[PDB]
Symmetry: D3
Subunit: 157 residues, 6 copies
């Protein structure tokens, strides 16, 4: 049985993230989406809220489940008997950031990382920029799953 | 069950490539290394020579095999009943180049591409630069599989 | 008064990515001239007259655009027509560096300025070179090119 | 008819690099509006009114430019004024990626287009943040800022 | 005769930094490592702690010494009668960041900057990521000098 | 005695190259400019012509001399009892290219490389683009030393 973890902040999950999940789920026997706090935010949504938004958006991926993670990512991965991380890349900035972490994670624990390329339609999509646009009344409905849009309006209103 | 294709010129295969193969083979049930011609490159070794060197260098990888293809990469992949490509990345230029092909390949055939980061030790290794260094007598023995190194140096001494 | 810009390139052949740039230029400048020029570091497929023809077919619905060719410096092409602006599109970091260098050189030697626009997300991976390669090996690039160009591309290949 | 573009930014403070962009925008658009906006991910030094004042002092010789502020989405600022174009400057690959993302987002949510221009080579290393840092520790940034701004910068620091 | 300054936050010094120091010291008659505060970073160790760790880690470098500075880097450099800065580069982002400062520093004071490429083995090493990994119990012992590693882990266990 | 080699095609030398030479000569006791053929050109100028253009443009750098090089760069460097290469960087493209060669050269021979940043004024300057602009009558006189401009016109006319 093959398996991978898809870690992130997912604050909130976007259609770009979902595209990664779908492609990971198509190639691995099990996918665990791990919701972690990134060391330099506090977030708009609680971990539990993030988890629910992901679960509601991934119901059609039967081999995917969602979990909170704390502490070191490579510990999370190894504790669940896996040895693969799946991340996504939009930009050269993503590439540099992710390459550093991938090499570090492999060095400290032997855990490998696979990257998927963004869909062209979602290349400019990030949680941070979506939240900013929405905060000032901009329409980001085409960039997010339905399970996020209402929650996002609620948190802003 | 799960499977991936690792395509490339592999002209010749380096320890950088082999590292990618090993990591792909450790995650997927079967891996097929696909030796293809890059339309935009001059080559040194024939496809058959490239296949020989990879087969020679991948003996410890039981679930991997090596084949060639004459057309579109996505046709090679789908004809073997697979839908995943695995490619390695060293540099930002690799990233842009590979992102473009990944999106093109997904657009025309629905085939997905997964990237892996180079091993830090092999980040500066390419077939082109290894060939160039060896052409002028530099020591690339730590960058290539043993059999590749012998065949490369022999080839160069024949001056072809 | 009326403003104007030149959209130069190899356009070998013109793609939906190029066309997106032309449309956006024509929306913001009173006058746009698409300039077909030879890149001295490229081996071309179509002739200049073929390239011009394909662009003209594909830009019928842009009333303030015309298509021309030139055989020397881009900046001479621009100034000869009483203009001082170039518009280019960017997909990648590599495009950015390449275009930045030319933009600064062109400003230095002639005082002509250059404006860049970002690719449409849907056309980020589209290039003339790759569409030609994919088409050569039977791949379907119909969603990446004008039907006009798709036909002329498939025509010569097959 | 007349064309128009908005040149938005933090401008905290405006530098010779920004001014170069304004001049080039004003040369190619009939109307330019410099928009002082808050970046929600930045801690600002000068007030909006101070920023506006420094830009106005520095752009006296550009007759077709005015300076305004906004408190919401850039694309609302642009459309409210009957415009559909943004002009931004690029120094680095990091600028390119950042601006590309915003340009595609802004086009997506409002249909507003963005044009980029390359930095003047002499101002490639100039940023508001670094000029402020260098000035704070006594360094001479006089060749990087308008004398107006240099004075107001040195003023608050000393 | 010839000399260069190697400036940085060095919070804490890593084997990546030390590699730069060694290569600078092998080319210039004297090297001064300058521990400076980066105005745009939160720090973990005091400047004095940083100096101690570097001094501890550079014993095999006879022509190198370590000092601190409170103002402009270019003032630190020129006050010691030097005119060269040496910095290392791992990534394209390092390059853009360092190019900007190099041009600024040459503009305001005429001081030159020389860059060196990271050792491939340490390309992914940064103080920030090493601190983060150690904060969560990961093994960064191969990335840091022995004394640094002890002081870092001790510091973290005190949870400061 | 410290020393470095400044290798390149220099076809022709530009004011950007000269800026590198000047900064190298200010920090090293001796600088050797090495004119090599880059494996993928044939060049506009002969090696001897390139050498003369450099010598004429560097007369004011008394600790700099100019030489042709053949074969492996790190052999050239070590044969002259040096262990340092000095290159220049304009762009991210330069950085990637040069970083690869610097790591390769250090790996195969232990020779180190130091890079200098371009002067802002010359960042867009390359031999290739200068030659192209000149070929179509463009004025590149502000980008090249005087010892190059006449030779360049002569080679084009
Ligand atoms: C939580 C981690 C993974 C950081 O996550 P991050 O905040 O970056 O996640 P974020 O939600 O922003 O993004 C998640 C992933 O989705 C990708 N992505 C986002 N949008 C898109 C898109 N449109 N298309 C494709 N991919 C996308 C991102 O590039 C990223 O890879 C990291 O902080 C971590 O591992 N923390 C645990 C502690 C640890 O182990 N530290 C050591 C690291 S070496
Ligand atoms: C043959 C193809 C894949 C090009 O291969 P390419 O020449 O780039 O392969 P090359 O041998 O150079 O490299 C192979 C792969 O190994 C990676 N790699 C190289 N060195 C290393 C290293 N040290 N570490 C990790 N990865 C590495 C490369 O980044 C690349 O991903 C391409 O031309 C192709 O697909 N041709 C078929 C026609 C086709 O389908 N065309 C349409 C493409 S959209
Ligand atoms: C012909 C010139 C402009 C080069 O053109 P080039 O070959 O690069 O054109 P090409 O057709 O490939 O692309 C044209 C433009 O479209 C852009 N583009 C391509 N695809 C896309 C897309 N999908 N989306 C947006 N933009 C795109 C390109 O980035 C480029 O800006 C250049 O060679 C030139 O100016 N030649 C004349 C001689 C001269 O003046 N030389 C001195 C130059 S400083
Ligand atoms: C205010 C905005 C535009 C950000 O501006 P920013 O802080 O980046 O401005 P800053 O003053 O730093 O720079 C302004 C512009 O000048 C350019 N520039 C700076 N220096 C130079 C130079 N030397 N040469 C050329 N250009 C330069 C910058 O690259 C940038 O394009 C952005 O935060 C915004 O739009 N805010 C409004 C809210 C909104 O709409 N959010 C959604 C965005 S998708
Ligand atoms: C302190 C300065 C230099 C910033 O240092 P910084 O925080 O970036 O240092 P840091 O420790 O992070 O890194 C130091 C150097 O080591 C390099 N480096 C890091 N890791 C590695 C590695 N593995 N290999 C090679 N090099 C490396 C970095 O790229 C950097 O060049 C800067 O803030 C400064 O000059 N401050 C003084 C005030 C001043 O003069 N300001 C004006 C500057 S224009
Ligand atoms: C000859 C070499 C160095 C390549 O030289 P190249 O053709 O790149 O030189 P070129 O003349 O183009 O440039 C010379 C240097 O000047 C720099 N430069 C150019 N313009 C500028 C500028 N305006 N500002 C700063 N630096 C500049 C370049 O970035 C480059 O570093 C290389 O091919 C080589 O080493 N060949 C020998 C064989 C060998 O050893 N091969 C193995 C290499 S690992």
């Amino acid at each position: 049985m093959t398996g991978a973890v898809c870690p992130g902040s997912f604050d909130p999950v976007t259609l770009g993230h979902l595209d990664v999940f779908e492609r990971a789920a198509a190639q691995f026997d099990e996918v665990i989406v791990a919701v972690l706090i990134n060391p330099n935010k506090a977030g708009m949504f609680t971990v539990d809220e993030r988890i629910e938004m992901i679960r509601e958006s991934t119901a059609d991926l039967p081999n995917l489940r969602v979990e909170s993670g704390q502490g070191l990512l490579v510990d999370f991965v190894r504790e669940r008997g896996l040895n693969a991380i799946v991340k996504g890349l939009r930009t050269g900035t993503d590439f540099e950031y992710e390459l550093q972490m991938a090499q570090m994670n492999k060095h400290i624990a032997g855990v490998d990382t696979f990257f998927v390329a963004t869909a062209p339609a979602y290349s400019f999509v990030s949680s941070s920029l979506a939240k900013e646009v929405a905060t000032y009344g901009g329409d980001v409905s085409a960039l997010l799953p339905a399970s996020v849009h209402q929650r996002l309006l609620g948190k802003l209103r």
